[PDB]
Amino acid sequence: VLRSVNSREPSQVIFCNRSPRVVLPVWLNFDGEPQPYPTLPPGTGRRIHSYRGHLWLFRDAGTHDGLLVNQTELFVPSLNVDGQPIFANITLPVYTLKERCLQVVRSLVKPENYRRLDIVRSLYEDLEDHPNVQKDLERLTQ
Amino acid sequence: MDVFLMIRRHKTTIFTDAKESSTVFELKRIVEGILKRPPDEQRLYKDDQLLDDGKTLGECGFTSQTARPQAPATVGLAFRADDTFEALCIEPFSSPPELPDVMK
Amino acid sequence: MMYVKLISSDGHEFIVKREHALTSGTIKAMLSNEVNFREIPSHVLSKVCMYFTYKVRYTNSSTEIPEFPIAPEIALELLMAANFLDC
Ligand SMILES: CC(=O)C1(C(=O)N[C@H](C(=O)N2C[C@H](O)C[C@H]2C(=O)NCc2ccc(-c3scnc3C)cc2)C(C)(C)C)CC1
Known part of the structure; x- marks a missing residue:
């Protein structure tokens, strides 16, 4: 499409x-x-x-x-x-505070260690789900 | 031009904005409306310097490019009880913890 | 102008416009004129208040947008607060 x-x-x-x-x-x-x-x-x-x-x-x-x-x-x-x-x-867009925090943390922690961070599993998933061009095209279709 | 501020006394902090051309006295009328103390019972400061009622915030160094929304300038506040003013005092914020090993 | 009071875990009291605080749906529900945050220290909640100012200023603006700044020291704690406040 x-x-x-x-x-x-x-x-x-x-x-x-x-x-x-x-x-x-x-x-x-x-x-x-x-x-x-x-x-x-x-x-x-x-x-x-x-x-x-x-x-x-x-x-x-x-x-x-x-x-x-x-x-x-x-x-x-x-x-x-x-x-x-x-x-x-x-x-730049006005990123949410949540998404901006995620950018900074990603830029400081190697992906292998996201799981050693002391946060709810819900945020570990949010960190590993990093921005991707394919995903955004699937979204923008819907 | 808007300037963005934190007005600070003891453990109180106010976020607001004002015009570069507005006066110290006018800023006290803002504080009056929020904390219910008239200008005559207020002193405002830039660091250790006492500000004159009739001066503009621009004259006193609060400019639109230093006093920004994401990083506002600080204005000190002191109240008078009875005859004499208190000394200016601003409680610092909390200290962050050590960076975790994974962030070093 | 209508203001509200947001109080941190360590007792600091931050006074912001009602409009700016309603950015958080969580804060809106905790009101619907003061709110106590038992888990958020002042070094985090002051940064939250600064984001409110930043968001309201630069939303729907054609003036170039500056990067909202976050120190490495306070990032993990700020993430956790943004998650809870939904901002
Ligand atoms: C006669 C053609 O070339 C046609 C066409 O559509 N061609 C496409 C084409 O020329 N495109 C696709 C896009 O419209 C852009 C254009 C293109 O590739 N232009 C050259 C180009 C090279 C570098 C840049 C950039 S981007 C950042 N810096 C530079 C130098 C931008 C454009 C291509 C299939 C060859 C890719 C069939 C019209």
Whole structure:
């Protein structure tokens, strides 16, 4: 269901990493498989060539945490008006306090030791259930 | 421009915000409405320095880029009982435990 | 403006706007004007109050968002509190 349309109509785009993370852009190809592209350092930008109807989303390249693009989940290049590119602003979301705590703990404890931490089993599961591009596509379909 | 604050006396802490252009006296009217003590029975401090009623919070060093939502600046509070003011006193927060072995 | 009092396990009393505290569904139920937390120390509950301010400020905003900061020392305890408060 979630896949780029093979439209063949060019669309120039600026990816702008207005986040503190290293950003990994992900193109959803014609069968819906997620295909990763070169990463952007924080505060940096790239003029790239994409196509109308093509699906993109964005992630932290190291932890796979999800980021937003123009205030939302998915980015689809539109028609270019007056020879001017489309701006794709990549930003941090307001993570819950729970999910932010989980990011920090994950970045301090090796996965083998999540089970030696003194917390309810319910949180051990939450830690091992780390962000993943496939899962989010299954969700976003529903 | 909004500045974000913790106003602190003894074991009391208030979270609120104010304009960079608002006055020390005006901040006391806020405290009055919350803790029920009028401005004349209040002293406010930046660290050890007593603040003048007519000065702005900007003049006194609370700016929109230092006094942030996720990391607000501290303003000290002291009350007067009868003739004389108490000395400024702010109870520290609790101390965290040692980092567990797995987090080292 | 309506405020509420959140009191930590060690006796510190934090006074925040009612609106900001209703971010937690747990706190909402404990009210429906003071609430005592027997398991949450002040070094954790002060950070919780700061997240309320941060959330209400940056939700629905086009100004770039800064990272909400958490020291390594207080992370495990803060996780446990966020889990209980559902925030
Ligand atoms: C004539 C084509 O090439 C068509 C097409 O859709 N081609 C796709 C294509 O060109 N794509 C898919 C996406 O729309 C993006 C575009 C592409 O791959 N562009 C090159 C490119 C290279 C690097 C970057 C990035 S991302 C971060 N930094 C850079 C330099 C961005 C784009 C591909 C099947 C070849 C992958 C059939 C129209």
